[PDB]
Ligand binder design. Structure first.
Ligand code: COH
Length: 153
């Protein structure tokens, strides 16, 4: 459970991410794809992208980044009371998209890295610690739904 002070650090930086969701989304997905190439294979629509330049020029990739960040932002703003938003997501990622929990850990790492590159001032160690706890809570809650459905892993 994050404390009120920790949720405030998380949402204060998130408010900045919202100033340019598309730019942030693009940066995150590219970092994920370059650091863990196996993640790209889960996207039939992005499989054809071979270079970072191709990735940066893809409008469709940018649109998916807005989708991901908008859904995450909706969750974070719920401050832990996020059952209604989380279940649908866990269900589709477990049974339709077939995304192992480990990939959620990889995208969390990509988010933390990009938040650091873009907002050093609002993203020091304390905010970094609170964001990591928020992302862990997100994975933990998704992992429990995955286990119920038989996808733990
Ligand atoms: C490694 C792949 C990967 C990761 C880690 C990931 C991580 C996350 C994540 C964590 C921060 C969030 C908040 C979301 C949120 C979403 N993802 Co994904 N998804 C992933 C692969 C996918 C795929 C694949 C789809 C469908 C894309 C398509 O083909 O249109 C998807 C679709 C979605 C959608 C549209 C509705 C739905 O299909 O469920 C939302 C919202 N998501 N995703």
């Amino acid at each position: 459970v994050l404390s009120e002070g920790e949720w405030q650090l998380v949402l204060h930086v998130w408010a900045k991410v919202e100033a340019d969701v598309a730019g942030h989304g693009q940066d995150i997905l590219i970092r994920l794809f370059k650091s863990h190439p196996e993640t790209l294979e889960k996207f039939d629509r992005f499989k054809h992208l071979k270079t970072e330049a191709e990735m940066k020029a893809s409008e469709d990739l940018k649109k998916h980044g807005v989708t991901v960040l908008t859904a995450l932002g909706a969750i974070l703003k719920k401050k832990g009371h996020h059952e209604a938003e989380l279940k649908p997501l866990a269900q589709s990622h477990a049974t339709k998209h077939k995304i192992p929990i480990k990939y959620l850990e990889f995208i969390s790492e990509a988010i933390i890295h990009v938040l650091h590159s873009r907002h050093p001032g609002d993203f020091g160690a304390d905010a970094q610690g609170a964001m990591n706890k928020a992302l862990e809570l997100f994975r933990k809650d998704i992992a429990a739904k995955y286990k119920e459905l038989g996808y733990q892993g």
